[PDB]
């Protein structure tokens, strides 16, 4: 029966159950075949699929639909025996997240997902059919592949010629055959965002080849040392370069040749001296520059030459002092210096008229300069975990202040001038209740009413 009809998931029968089956076979093999299906495993899994389809009705899936951070409708499937056939009846679905779903075939019914843009294959090797493959080739924009094994990467993903954003999660390098599964990335002619979290010990050649049109390269070696070794100065169309946990311990000189770069992230690179930023004057559009989570001991005065900076991140470092040249960047809008050994703020901090977020959390700031309150559009502040002795009375000058963090300081009384901020609400006043009790009752009532409205 199973050699003809191809149902190999029927194990041989042991004692006292093969005897009765032999008797039945002598009477009529029809009963043998009517029993074999019910004893098979393929049939049980298919019946499980049908029960899944019946259980996850369209209303159930719609109630299960959520919206991710990007305000997109999301369906995250976890530990299901397969893709329910009714997940393709929701035309409003935008992102399909599949995690730990085995023996999964993408049906042609996925073509009904006109609004589908992102497909997350979490530890899921899925086969696809020609209609569904063509639909995804014409429609799918983003693909998230997380794999503990090379073979778990579907091999049809290189035929998606409208893909723009590919996220590779999982170790891919191997001995004597490295960077060959991703030889098909050249065929992704419309790829723009390439995220590589694979413990690369050297940037694969195909990445450099496909980077001529890449606009954002993101690498997360999770501790592995990454050697660029002159493989990065060809992606002149790049505008965002993220090197997270690459263990660089040094800024490579290949970055400064990317004349179109705007956002450079160097998180967890164990940076010590960042005096390489003198070469960043070549990048004539460098707006955001994240250097957080490093061992940076000092901010070089050459950071003043980067007059086009708007966002500067230097938190989680070993910075002890702030140079006065840092305040030559009058375009600066974010200056996050949280978790540092800073003890005071230079008076030039008020020169940055466009500063809007200033976090100095977890420092040794015992007092704030009065010049700090010249930044009238300072929407948010974070002065928590400091050693602030007293809050200056000029806090009310910042009319646009909305969210100010104050828990963890050595404060005794909150200023009455703190309540004159037109937009500050109890939600935006993060402070201990003992300190909050010091406000005048009019201020308390106004804050509570604002929080209500």
């Amino acid at each position: 029966i199973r050699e003809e009809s191809s149902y190999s998931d029927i194990p041989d029968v042991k004692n006292d159950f093969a005897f009765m089956l032999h008797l039945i076979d002598q009477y009529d093999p029809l009963y043998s075949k009517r029993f074999a299906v019910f004893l098979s495993e393929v049939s049980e899994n298919k019946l499980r699929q049908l029960n899944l389809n019946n259980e996850w009705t369209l209303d159930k899936l719609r109630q299960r639909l959520t919206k991710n951070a990007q305000d997109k409708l999301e369906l995250h499937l976890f530990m299901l025996s397969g893709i329910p056939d009714t997940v393709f009846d929701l035309v409003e679905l935008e992102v399909l997240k599949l995690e730990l779903i085995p023996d999964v075939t993408i049906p042609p019914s996925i073509a009904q997902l006109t609004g589908l843009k992102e497909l997350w294959l979490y530890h899921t090797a899925a086969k696809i059919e020609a209609p569904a493959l063509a639909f995804l080739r014409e429609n799918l924009r983003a693909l998230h592949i997380k794999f503990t094994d090379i073979k778990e990467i579907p091999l049809w993903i290189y035929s998606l010629k409208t893909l723009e954003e590919l996220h590779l999660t999982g170790n891919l390098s191997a001995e004597n055959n490295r960077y060959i599964v991703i030889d098909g990335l050249r065929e992704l002619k419309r790829l723009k965002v390439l995220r590589l979290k694979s413990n690369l010990s050297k940037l694969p050649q195909v990445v450099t080849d496909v980077g001529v049109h890449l606009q954002k390269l993101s690498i997360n070696n999770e501790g592995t040392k990454l050697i660029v070794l002159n493989s990065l100065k060809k992606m002149v169309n790049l505008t965002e370069l993220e090197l997270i946990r690459c263990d660089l311990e040094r800024i490579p000189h290949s970055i400064f040749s990317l004349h179109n770069l705007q956002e450079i992230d160097l998180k967890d690179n164990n940076l010590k001296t960042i005096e390489e930023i003198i070469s960043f004057q070549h990048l004539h559009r460098l707006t955001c520059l994240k250097l957080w989570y490093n061992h940076i001991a000092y901010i070089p005065i050459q950071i003043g030459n980067l007059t086009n900076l708007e966002r500067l991140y230097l938190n989680r470092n070993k910075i002890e002092k702030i140079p006065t040249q840092l305040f030559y960047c009058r375009k600066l809008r974010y200056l996050d210096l949280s978790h540092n050994n800073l003890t005071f703020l230079p008076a030039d901090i008020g020169l940055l008229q466009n500063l809007q977020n200033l976090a100095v959390t977890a420092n040794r700031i015992e007092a704030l300069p009065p010049e700090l309150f010249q930044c009238r559009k300072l929407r948010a502040l974070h002065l928590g975990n400091n050693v602030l002795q007293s809050l200056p009375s000029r806090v009310g000058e910042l009319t646009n202040l909305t969210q100010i963090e104050l828990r963890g300081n050595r404060l005794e009384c909150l200023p009455v001038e703190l309540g004159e901020c037109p937009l500050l609400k109890r939600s935006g006043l993060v402070v201990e209740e003992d300190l909050f009790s010091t406000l005048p009752p009019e201020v308390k009532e106004r804050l509570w009413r604002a929080d209500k409205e």
Partner: nanobody
Amino acid sequence: QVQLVESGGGLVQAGGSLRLSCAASGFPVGRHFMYWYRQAPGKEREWVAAIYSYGEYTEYADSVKGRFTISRDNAKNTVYLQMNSLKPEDTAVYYCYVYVGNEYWGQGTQVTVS
């Protein structure tokens, strides 16, 4: 105990060549970035050039690109600033800056061009 002192400045015609010497005592010159700065009278100080701590990577300002040169010698522990194709605009006082533990500035050599 690092001393930064400049020499080789003066008054020279335009379109010529001039050379500056920055004397470093307390630190090896090849192991720290050396920055040349200029300050025009009645003007904020302007960066001139820099040398990397490795690979002989050099940086120059946009207005002075292709005209000035920077070099250093570890045997004698000095930084050379070679000024070429000079103009009355490049009349400023030149400083060689370093950061070895703290901020260090040179004495400053007066440079004037006709």
